[PDB]
């Protein structure tokens, strides 16, 4: 029993030493605060953790985004659909019909690359270690990346889907600029409303002299 009490006392001493070490660590943290680099480190860590928390999951996010952009494109008419965007999406959706699409979630990012064969294939033409794609060509076969929130390419190609710049080529160069001031409809309203303005009169005397001479000419012609 005495030996057990001594062991308990030793455990208590170890706990006291750990508490002293924790106090020393707190003092070191206070010293770091006295000297903002630690605040910047904390901010960087918080940003990393926030990115890792709100990272893009393929299984739901990519399926939903693709299958929703397809719906957005359906409604439009063939005369107004940016050919390149429709083609890109038909591609992404002609793969997913197969299993060519793969996915991976990093801690701060997430990629979507294509393979040349599906995942259930057990052929040797697909399993051969000497036909698989090279390491250096992986970035040449990546499709859509989610930096922090949503996907940063699908949106980029889905941003101007309605506009079709094919039939707008009957125009000079200074009609193709589509800078935003031409869409925010504040100035056009003013210019339209300022069409009916009480016009000023300043030359009443000379104008009426001209009208008088004109009626005199008419009278002369009547005779």
């Amino acid at each position: 029993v005495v030996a057990k009490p001594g062991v308990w006392a030793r455990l208590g001493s170890w706990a006291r030493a750990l508490l002293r070490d924790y106090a020393e660590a707190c003092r070191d943290a206070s010293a770091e605060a006295r000297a903002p680099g630690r605040a910047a480190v904390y901010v960087g860590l918080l940003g990393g953790a926030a990115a890792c928390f709100t990272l893009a999951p393929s299984e739901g996010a990519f399926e939903e985004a693709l299958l929703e952009a397809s719906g957005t494109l359906l409604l439009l008419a063939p005369a107004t659909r940016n050919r390149e965007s429709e083609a890109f999406v038909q591609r992404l959706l002609w793969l997913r019909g197969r299993g060519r699409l793969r996915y991976v979630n990093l801690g701060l990012c997430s990629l979507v690359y294509e393979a040349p064969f599906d995942a259930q294939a057990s052929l040797y033409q697909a399993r051969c270690r000497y036909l698989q794609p090279r390491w250096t060509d992986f970035p040449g076969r990546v499709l859509d990346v989610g930096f922090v929130g949503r996907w940063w390419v699908l949106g980029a190609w889905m941003r101007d889907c309605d506009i079709n710049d094919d039939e707008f080529l009957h125009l000079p160069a200074h009609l193709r600029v589509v800078g935003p001031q031409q869409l925010h409809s504040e100035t056009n309203e003013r210019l339209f409303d300022e069409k009916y303005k009480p016009v000023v009169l300043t030359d009443d005397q000379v104008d009426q002299a001209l009208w008088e001479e004109q009626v005199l000419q008419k009278e002369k012609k009547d005779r």
């Binding site: 309605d162 935003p180 869409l183 925010h184 409809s185 504040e186």
Partner: protein
């Protein structure tokens, strides 16, 4: 007794739309414009109701 209703429908659509949406940057309405539509509908309806009441307030003294 029904044509006036659709007339008001069209007129208030025109009003709300002309008075809120001013971006035309994206083909799809923003939520702010949905709030516009809601508020405009409610306000124009209350205004029409009050107009009708104050107009009957003219016939109560005219008849």
């Amino acid at each position: 007794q029904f044509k006036e209703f659709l007339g008001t429908y069209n007129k208030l659509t025109e009003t709300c739309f002309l008075d809120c949406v001013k971006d035309f940057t994206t083909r799809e309405v923003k939520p702010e414009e949905t709030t516009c539509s809601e508020h405009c509908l409610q306000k124009y309806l209350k205004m029409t109701q009050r107009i009708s009441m104050r107009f009957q307030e003219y016939h109560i003294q005219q008849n």
